[PDB]
Amino acid sequence: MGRDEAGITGTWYNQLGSTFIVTAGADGALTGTYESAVGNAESRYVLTGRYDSAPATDGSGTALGWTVAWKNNYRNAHSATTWSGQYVGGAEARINTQWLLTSGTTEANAWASTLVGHDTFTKVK
């Protein structure tokens, strides 16, 4: 029943070679796994998030976000990334994001706790 439930659900790849597998729920849920090609990461990590299940019908994209905390059975990078973005449908469907990666730090080092970047996900490559 979600407008882009079908368009969003599946396997996505970003420009770093990371893989995001996601299921979109009718109501707005996102659940899945993430495997990063870079950084202090091995194998899959749990992800959860939310998307707008009833987007505007004027050619606008579909807002969404999700989170990964970088702990699984293999490693713990004491950090979490959140991606905020929009899904755009069609023959070259994309999810265009910006992300914030916060590490656990001492209060002294907190100023330097957060990295910022941008990932573009596609259904190919």
Add this chain to the structure above:
Amino acid sequence: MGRDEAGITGTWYNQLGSTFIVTAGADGALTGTYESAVGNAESRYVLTGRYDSAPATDGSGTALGWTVAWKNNYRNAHSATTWSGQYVGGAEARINTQWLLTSGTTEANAWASTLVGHDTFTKVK
């Protein structure tokens, strides 16, 4: 079994007067509701996220994040915010975040799709 499962779970308030109610799961889950005191928002919205359930024991904070998509039974703001941050425990416990708020836009307006800010959550006020 999560290290800050107890410290995180509950009701938090930010500097805008918004209210975040969250349950932390032993494994890393965050689930809850968010009510914003500002913007195109009314009542509670679903939130989901992840936290590091086994943080460093050296006085570092606990990395976490979560997402709200701004649709509920009342309104649809065609947008989603993700908060990335760290929980710091103790008598003045805090969750210090930065956030990204993406709106669904046309490809023409996509450059201007994302707001960035910072929220500090406390257990009082």
Add this chain to the structure above:
Amino acid sequence: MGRDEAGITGTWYNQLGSTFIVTAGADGALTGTYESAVGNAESRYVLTGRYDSAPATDGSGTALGWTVAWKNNYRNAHSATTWSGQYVGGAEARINTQWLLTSGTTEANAWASTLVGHDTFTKVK
């Protein structure tokens, strides 16, 4: 005498079709003009910034930034963008940035004052 003084100075174009003309000084200065292909902007606007005039020699990029306040003789958009990034030299030289665009706002609307994005500049197109 600046290491990338020569590589940086000139005309650059981003993915939106904007044009950045810059002179790099030996000491670290950047001065120039910016013309945005989008938004509340017409013609050229003054820019100033700074770059690292003695970068690492290990294949690392060259950190830099600059600012435009969106006032000139034609328009005043009551806003300023800052680009932070790195210059990478070679046959496909690039300046890879992230940017923050702050508008003047009332204290009530300050939460929503700042847009964030990413621009990639090239010497062609």
Add this chain to the structure above:
Amino acid sequence: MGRDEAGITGTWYNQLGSTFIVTAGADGALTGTYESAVGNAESRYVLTGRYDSAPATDGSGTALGWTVAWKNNYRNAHSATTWSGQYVGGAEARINTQWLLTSGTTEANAWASTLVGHDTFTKVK
């Protein structure tokens, strides 16, 4: 002749204990020095930037930004910070910023090149 030329020019202090000394020009220029209380920094560093010299008269703040590249005669941190923000005048005048700190990196590590934060400057402390 700049509206907040007088309000902006002077010495400012942020929550980390850093010191920003700035002169505002009638036309929009900002020039000065910055001394960071944290990070890979010693003594003063050159800063340059721009502000809106004719802000809205409706109680809105005054948009501005500036850049520091972290090289001076003492150290070179192969990095640059840009602050984007707004000046708010009155008895408790403030400059409320967000900042992007980019390091020069290899193309492999570029994903992790940029830190993001927020500084609040005041005329006291």
